[PDB]
Amino acid sequence: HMDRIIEKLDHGWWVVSHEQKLWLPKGELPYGEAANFDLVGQRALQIGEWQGEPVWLVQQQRRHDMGSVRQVIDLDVGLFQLAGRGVQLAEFYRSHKYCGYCGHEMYPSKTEWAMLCSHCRERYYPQIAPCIIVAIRRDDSILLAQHTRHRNGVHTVLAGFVEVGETLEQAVAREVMEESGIKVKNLRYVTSQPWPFPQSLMTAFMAEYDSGDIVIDPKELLEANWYRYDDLPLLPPPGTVARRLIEDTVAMCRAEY
């Protein structure tokens, strides 16, 4: 897997990335012939395929329509994984322009997704951050929060990075306690999914309210409350782990009615 100059008849999906953003003209991920996106002559890297068509990464700034890769979730959750990894790879290259061991310039491996040193023998691989995500059920109610980071009107479940020395279970209890001040029980693992940028592994849990009153960390959350399961506010998009977890909670509440 090596980079190359785009030609006129090159076709596929174009992940055109600059400064942790990607280009989404008309709010869509560029699809089609390179010439229609003024991409001929640019250097691109194939980072995957989607529906038997290449996905290309290109590092270029555009004047308009640069945005976060989260916007792609709402387009297609599968393509989101490809596009975000593109964005992550550009950031991985940027954070390893110089060798942390010896200070010389690095260059990308051709046989792995790695950064190699022009001088020494060391190398770097992109990291995957373990993450928890948890839906907390209180009887016929579920805890949903609006996050400060997004400010997008979407009510969702709690999530955080696993810290050094912690199990997933300890990460769940800690994160919940920190963000909302509640204690949980009946922790149960339900599934996992990759998240592409920042590159992470989300482990999804279900849990029941144990004790405490909600007091939000304002650095993390704007609002948090218990919402009756059959009367929920605006939720994350269908197909996301967050949404699937909320809907399973709804399904279990339905089961006790």
Positions that interact with a second copy (CB under 8 A): 81, 85, 94-103, 106, 113, 122, 124, 126-130, 162, 164-169, 189, 191-194, 196, 199, 201, 203
Q: Which of 15, 73, 79, 99 binds Zn ion (CB under 5 A)?
A: 99
- Characterize the bridge pairing of strands 158-161 and 141-147: unpaired
175 is in an annotated binding site: yes
Q: How far is the CB of 45 from a second copy (least distance, A)?
A: 15
Q: Is 205 annotated as a binding residue?
A: no
x/- letters, 116..155, toward Zn ion (CB under 5 A): -x-xx-----------------------------------
Check binding of 82 to Zn ion (CB under 5 A): no
Contact (Cβ atoms closer than 8 angstroms) between residue 143 and residue 157: yes
In the bound state with a second copy, the residue whose beta carbon lies nearer, of 12 and 86, is 86
125 labelled ligand-binding: yes
Residue nearest to Zn ion (CB): 99
The piece of 20-28, 46-54, 91-99, 237-245 that touches Zn ion (CB under 5 A) is 91-99
- Residue 117 labelled as part of a binding site: yes
Nearer to a second copy, 192 or 225 (CB): 192
95 binds Zn ion (CB under 5 A): no
Q: Which residues are annotated as a binding site?
A: 26, 70, 99, 102, 112, 117, 120, 125, 159, 175, 179, 193-200, 220, 242
